Amino acid sequence: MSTRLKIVTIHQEPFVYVKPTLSDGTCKEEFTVNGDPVKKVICTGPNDTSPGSPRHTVPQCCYGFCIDLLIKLARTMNFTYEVHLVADGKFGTQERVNKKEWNGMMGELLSGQADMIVAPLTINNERAQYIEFSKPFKYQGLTILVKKGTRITGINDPRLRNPSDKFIYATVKQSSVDIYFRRQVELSTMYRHMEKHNYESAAEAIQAVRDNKLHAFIWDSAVLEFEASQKCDLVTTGELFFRSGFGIGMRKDSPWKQNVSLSILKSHENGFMEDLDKTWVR
Amino acid sequence: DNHLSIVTLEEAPFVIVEDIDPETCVRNTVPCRKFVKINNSTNEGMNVKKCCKGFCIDILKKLSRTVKFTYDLYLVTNGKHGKKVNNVWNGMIGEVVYQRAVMAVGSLTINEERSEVVDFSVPFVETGISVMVSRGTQVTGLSDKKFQRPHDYSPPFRFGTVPNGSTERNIRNNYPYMHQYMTKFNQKGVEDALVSLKTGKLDAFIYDAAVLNYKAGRDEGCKLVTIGSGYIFATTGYGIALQKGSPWKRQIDLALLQFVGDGEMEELETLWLTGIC
Ligand SMILES: CCNC(=O)c1c(C)sc2nc(Cc3cccc(C(F)(F)F)c3F)cc(=O)n12
Ligand SMILES: N[C@@H](CCC(=O)O)C(=O)O
Ligand SMILES: [Ca+2]
Incomplete structure (x- = not known):
């Protein structure tokens, strides 16, 4: 009823x-x-x-x-x-x-x-x-979460634009960030690395940055900045890219x-x- | 039914109006007509051919190309952005409401009362309400006691806005004492307000965040600043106003979202809005 x-x-x-x-x-x-x-x-x-x-x-x-x-x-x-x-x-x-x-x-x-x-x-x-x-x-927009001590300029850092199995980065599978890195031809190199490491959830990924399993996590600034302020062992790095709203x-x-x-x-x-x-x- | 009547309003750097070649519209300019009165004892007047450019004009060019429409652009002469007087809308909002325009393109703020009478596109410029002061003026923001309770100060803080737009409407709705106090400091326009801030006749100027951020970025000697790190109260955006139930909204929204994704919006921001300060 x-x-x-x-x-x-x-x-x-x-x-x-x-x-x-x-x-x-x-x-x-x-x-x-x-x-x-x-x-x-x-x-x-x-x-x-x-x-x-x-x-x-x-x-x-x-x-x-x-x-x-x-x-x-x-x-x-x-x-x-x-x-x-x-x-x-x-x-x-x-x-x-x-x-x-x-x-x-x-x-x-x-x-x-x-x-x-x-x-x-x-x-x-x-x-x-x-x-x-x-x-x-x-x-809000997109930003990068790392363990404190790691130095990165942002999205245009050579450790991201020229990927290697040394520094592992990712985002959440089946999300808007996944969509963005797949649509943009300029992010193809970045996407090919990510598609191998992408996490099931933002919480699984944030924990893996803390456990040195993942080195960089690309996600929503509204979530990442909240996490960085709560967990001082994690810091957001670089400036905001791909600004977008929540609806x-x-x-x-x-x-x-x-x-x-x-x-x-x-x-x-x-x-x-x-x-x-x-x-x-x- | 692809040729659309489009209304705009001058407000740099979003819409900049120029005179035509003394014979047509060269460069990145588009033609825009303005109805000019012969005198004030008649309704008789004439359309003057002008040229339009700016951030919003570039958005209109991209939309026209992507959504596949042609247009006749004109400048509003009955009011400015949009004000409801006894339930009768003037400005760019009024032109759309009364179906003299298919869409309104410009520095047009999305707000609840306008959304009741027109359809807005997804936002394409981040804005709201900001406070411009001469560097060194101590105010936390719109909720500072200097604004909220002005007569608790000797002499009281002198602040105003350009009336009849979304900023005045918001202040009228949220801060009744502040609004009735400010009206003696109403500014005819942004240029008069900035000069009052520089001639020491005004302590603060409250207005559209996007326009103030631009003006602060180009201020000679960087004397005039927006409070905070350019803090925005009543965060909103500029949107294209379309008639309620418009068949054009779907494609315009999809095209604006496509422009953001491709970094084409960031380019327009670099080209038109960034400054020295
Ligand atoms: C085509 C998709 N648009 C954008 O990515 C976008 C810009 C490119 S500038 C801008 N500004 C806001 C600011 C804003 C915040 C909260 C609420 C609103 C509103 F409700 F008015 F829409 C806003 F516009 C929101 C927003 O999405 N964009
Ligand atoms: N963008 C505003 C005009 C300026 C303002 O009132 O802040 C509007 O659409 O009403
Ligand atoms: Ca929509």
Whole structure:
């Protein structure tokens, strides 16, 4: 009987934190430094994160910048919803099967497994051909994460432009960064190295930089800078390249698209988005 | 139905208007007409052939080529960017609302109330509200108590904006005391405001982030600066305004996203917006 919107998200701190529920099935009552209670949602998702493995779905606790944004959107527009984490753990690329298919949250939204994507989902040309993106809720770019001590000028450093098996670098598989390094002819050499080392998740990659398994991680500045400020053993290097925004994703025939963008614009104008930025990102 | 009526407005470096060759539009310029009145006792006037260039004009050239349309570019004469008066829109927004233009190209800020009456493209220039001061002036930003509670200071801080645009609308909505206080310091335009900042008649000038960053970058002697590292309150962007339900939006959005991906936007930023300071 449920007419609730199905929301798909992904584990991606500081936008989406994913934690286990307590034994009673509720979310641990936590507070910000501002003394305000952290709003939390029950989000179902697979427990076994491993690829090509059976997915056992369990209720979990979701919170962060994107959850606070969802709550405001649902409040403003008066919609009911239920949250789940993308079964395959990916953002979403279109891959060759003659036929082509979308994976990640893109695939879930297009199949009908989701009615809206509320995550740090990059707005790019490839996705915009198939889905409606709201006006951006955040404008950021790409940067590089390294272990402290490593010296790199940025993307144009000889250790990246002239690859070798000595210095290993990567990004997340089936993500907008993966799309970008594959589309741009000028990044072909860089992509050929990366396609061999690319990680299943940003968290797996950040941990491998810490464990000296990966030397450089190319990812979203909004995520990398947050990680660098929290883990002082990791530092962001170089200047920002490929600037892009994050947007809410919907199917092209969604009746909510105009009011989702209007709500995002209202939130930028009244300081709500800056409040979220202060609570979670800076 | 490929030949489109397009409205623009002069605002350097986004749209720069020049006189025609004393016979046509040479170089990187495109023709733009401006309706000029014979006098103020009549509605009679004439179209004056001018030449247009700039960051937004280069975007229009790329879109025209990629999306495959031709156009008749004109400069708005009824207001500027867009203001709602008793539910009646003027400026570039008004021209689109009242279907005298298919699209508005320029330094046009995306905001919620304009989005209720027009469709905006994806943003293609990052902007919002910034504060220009003479180097050394101590203000944290738009939320500093000098702005929020001006009369707590002796003498009070003197600050203003150019009224009737998205900056004034935002301040009116968010900071009612600040807005009613600022109105005595309303500036006719950006050139008058900068001169008031230099002649010591103004302490701060609040305006569109993209235009202030450009003006700070070219300021003679680099005396005038934007607070913070060019901090932006009410972050937004410039977008192309199209009529609600426009068949042109899909392709324009796809073309603008394609331009960013290919580094073609970064080139325009290098060519038109960067400066000495
Ligand atoms: C064609 C894709 N556009 C871009 O990659 C892009 C620029 C190239 S400049 C710019 N500026 C913002 C700033 C911004 C931040 C938050 C919210 C908004 C808004 F809601 F107005 F759209 C913004 F425009 C967002 C943004 O995507 N771009
Ligand atoms: N870009 C603004 C004009 C300048 C401003 O008010 O800051 C607008 O579209 O209204
Ligand atoms: Ca779109």
